[PDB]
Symmetry: C2
Amino acid sequence: MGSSHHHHHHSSGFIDIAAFESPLTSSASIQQLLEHWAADARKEFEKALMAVLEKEPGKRDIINQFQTCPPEILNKLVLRPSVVLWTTVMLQASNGITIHSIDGELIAPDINYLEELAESLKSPNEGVPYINRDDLWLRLPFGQRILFESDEVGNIGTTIVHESLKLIESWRPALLSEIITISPEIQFIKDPTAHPDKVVSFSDNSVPGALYVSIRQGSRYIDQYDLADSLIHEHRHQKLYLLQRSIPLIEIDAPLVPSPWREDLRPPSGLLHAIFVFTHLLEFWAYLSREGQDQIKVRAKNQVETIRTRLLVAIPTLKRTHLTTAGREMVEQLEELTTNMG
Amino acid sequence: MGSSHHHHHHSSGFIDIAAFESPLTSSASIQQLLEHWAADARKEFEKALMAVLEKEPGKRDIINQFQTCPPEILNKLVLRPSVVLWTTVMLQASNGITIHSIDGELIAPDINYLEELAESLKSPNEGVPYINRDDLWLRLPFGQRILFESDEVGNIGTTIVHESLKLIESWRPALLSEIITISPEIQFIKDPTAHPDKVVSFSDNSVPGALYVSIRQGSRYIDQYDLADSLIHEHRHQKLYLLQRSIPLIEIDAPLVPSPWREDLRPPSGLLHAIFVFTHLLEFWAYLSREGQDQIKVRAKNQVETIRTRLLVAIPTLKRTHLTTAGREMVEQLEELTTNMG
């Protein structure tokens, strides 16, 4: 009924991947991928700064703040989710290309964002992962379809996030460090169309580095384990976005493959993102089923059985797809982790 | 809630197209595109025949009938929707790549299809557009999600199809000839999940040349005008599949753009397919509002207003996308037809 049948793909005729997977051995690989991405993003940001000066030459004094800015600060600034979206929308607007939010609304290029962006350089040291910061260029890709929690709602959510991050740190301190480097922004969302008891968490690569997690289950708040699951789930997408940017994993994103997590046929890259996400959540709930409290051991044992079953069905499905050399190396490493935990 | 946010396209940084659009002036352009496609498909079909001989060398006598078959027959055979799907599934199976139907079921490569296919050469070729032919390799991309009408249901549908094709011939005899060349197969379907009053019609490029139209709708049957709309709608997809095959129309199928026909963001190629489909449907209902019967003039005037309104909103949206030189030439020709309607 829904369908995706017009695919133009009816033409079917340099880093350690294994070390990148585990947070213990990924530190160097991530730094290497971030340096390559920041090299392209600095040029893109400079191109956007020149486009701002063409429309409004009066913005020259605002642009001057970045000119003398140290490259160490500038390299971290151009990779922020809100900055990447602003730079992308800005460059596409100059090429006559429109960018829209999920609700079909046009994301207008705002020159006045540079003034807010320049004033951020006057206080560089802030919280390691930015918990529910008020930034329109983080809310823009969703428009009105997704609501952003604020005030008392955000105040309570910050404390639950702190306990989820402390829980993640107790399991793997290397994964918390990985979260600070790849996913530095945590936004609190609420899906009005979703069922109150459903935990909603999503990620978009138009804003890379921002994790959108729901803290409210109706009027009630979710717990530190479910919120840590949501944070790890979206962090794994952000981590794979970084790898895909430089080292492609899928040679041909067709034909569509079935996923144990979706009813419809999803592309091979989507199933790779799903296995990459759920491999880390299988390891998280495996730790909670052994070294966790007696109250969590019931839910954790259910999650291990549910996730391992789905992973053991998705991995063979993905193996018979157009995977690159790096993509196949990733699948074989994720399969090894699922097998060594049965 | 639904979402499609992991697009690996976060890297945003000759044929007479006008003559191809109208069926009156497309005859030569279509023949050129079909000759190029048949040249590649004949090699792909030969590769599949050699793969059949590797698995079962006993099928040597059946493969010899195809190899010694006249090129005029063989060129038309390799481009049939059921043959294209068989060849694709067969070649992908040899490369360790699985193909699935919309319901997630694996489409198994059937060597025994060649025997049924060889008996089609020996049999006298019936009616130019094959109305509801019993062929599993036409039903395979849908599996169990879509039901195929047969017996008394198909018997009635054949008569309604004949009146729809006669209605299309009375409007533009060039469009009926175009239908016989590009879309030679009409299958009768029923979507159990769809609302009875909804007219369901779809097409897939894994089976190019097959139009899937619904004839039974609730406790009634579709009329010749609604069925002609369904046939023209799916034929326009099949015609654009042929063009896209050789001459690409979208340079970058990102960012996602809003469509007046769908609730959420669809790719630029999807919106191009929609405008290409609805431009011809606008011309069809414009003819029915002027030269049609008094009973159809009410429905036709409503369709012209509904379709022109949506086309006038989709065309500017698509113009601000990564269109190739040919893609932009197509959009400007479709915009001219929409504008020249008052």
